[PDB]
Design an enzyme around this catalytic site. Structure first.
Site, mmCIF file in Angstrom:
data_model
loop_
_atom_site.group_PDB
_atom_site.id
_atom_site.type_symbol
_atom_site.label_atom_id
_atom_site.label_comp_id
_atom_site.label_asym_id
_atom_site.label_seq_id
_atom_site.Cartn_x
_atom_site.Cartn_y
_atom_site.Cartn_z
ATOM 1 N N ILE A 151 36.126 66.127 40.635
ATOM 2 C CA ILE A 151 35.429 66.895 39.611
ATOM 3 C C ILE A 151 35.095 65.996 38.425
ATOM 4 O O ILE A 151 35.875 65.111 38.074
ATOM 5 C CB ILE A 151 36.285 68.076 39.118
ATOM 6 C CG1 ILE A 151 36.862 68.847 40.305
ATOM 7 C CG2 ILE A 151 35.471 68.993 38.219
ATOM 8 C CD1 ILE A 151 37.793 69.966 39.906
ATOM 9 N N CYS A 152 33.939 66.224 37.811
ATOM 10 C CA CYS A 152 33.492 65.393 36.700
ATOM 11 C C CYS A 152 33.647 66.121 35.364
ATOM 12 O O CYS A 152 32.698 66.724 34.860
ATOM 13 C CB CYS A 152 32.042 64.947 36.913
ATOM 14 S SG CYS A 152 31.569 63.424 36.048
#
Lengths: 78, 152
Positions: free
Chosen positions: B89-90
């Protein structure tokens, strides 16, 4: 044995431990010297407002300390 | 270690605070027995193409928690510009931008408010990021096509 039970307040904002050397950050936030010091090893910032923070800027809060110590003393009877 | 028992004591409160207060559409618990290992679930926001699908995550707490950010990522496949095949996830919140004041409860929300609005200028999956930008209809359709077969 002993425990807490501590009346919040005395408790550390992050870890919720009982404090032994309360200090106030510029933020106005009160932390246990031990905890906050460990944070300053990673990043030199207030763990809340994310503003720059160094040891120098930590002012002790004796009023609370005595309050805690006295409390611990009361928790020595009965 | 002592920094171990401490990190744990914190982790505990966080969990007790997700009982006295569950986040929006978000649910998380220890994988049983092991406390530094949690799984999370997300009901796919209703303002997103993932509406309906349930997405599982794995949260691995550093032994230096909360001084170091918790490693977390999806197990469930999901079509999104900021989530890749691995499950990564960013979120800046999960990298250099994590504050010890931050909590799991908070992070899940940050993740939901990402599934609703993605950040495509800093994408984990460029191919998709370009679809979001250029052709939304495409994106939404596809996102649901995946939410359909993968998350239900």
């Amino acid at each position: 044995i002993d425990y807490s039970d501590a009346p919040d307040e005395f408790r550390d904002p992050l870890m919720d431990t009982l404090m032994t050397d309360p200090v106030r950050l510029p933020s106005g936030t009160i932390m246990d010297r031990s905890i906050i010091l460990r944070h300053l090893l990673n990043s030199p910032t207030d763990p809340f407002n994310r503003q720059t923070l160094t040891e120098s800027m930590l002012e002790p809060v004796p009023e609370l300390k005595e309050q805690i110590q006295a409390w611990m003393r009361e928790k020595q009877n009965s | 270690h002592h920094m171990n028992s401490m990190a744990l004591k914190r982790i505990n409160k966080e969990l007790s605070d997700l009982a006295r207060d569950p986040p929006a559409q978000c649910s998380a618990g220890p994988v049983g027995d092991d406390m530094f290992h949690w799984q999370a679930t997300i009901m796919g926001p209703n303002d997103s193409p993932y509406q309906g699908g349930v997405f599982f995550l794995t949260i691995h707490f550093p032994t230096d928690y909360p001084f170091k950010p918790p490693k977390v990522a999806f197990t469930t496949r999901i079509y999104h510009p900021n989530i890749n095949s691995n499950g990564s996830i960013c979120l800046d919140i999960l990298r250099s931008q994590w504050s010890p004041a931050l909590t799991i409860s908070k992070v899940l929300l940050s993740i939901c408010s990402l599934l609703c609005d993605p950040n495509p200028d800093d994408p984990l999956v460029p191919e998709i990021a370009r679809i979001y930008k250029t052709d939304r209809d495409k994106y939404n359709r596809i996102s649901r096509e995946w939410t359909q077969k993968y998350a239900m």
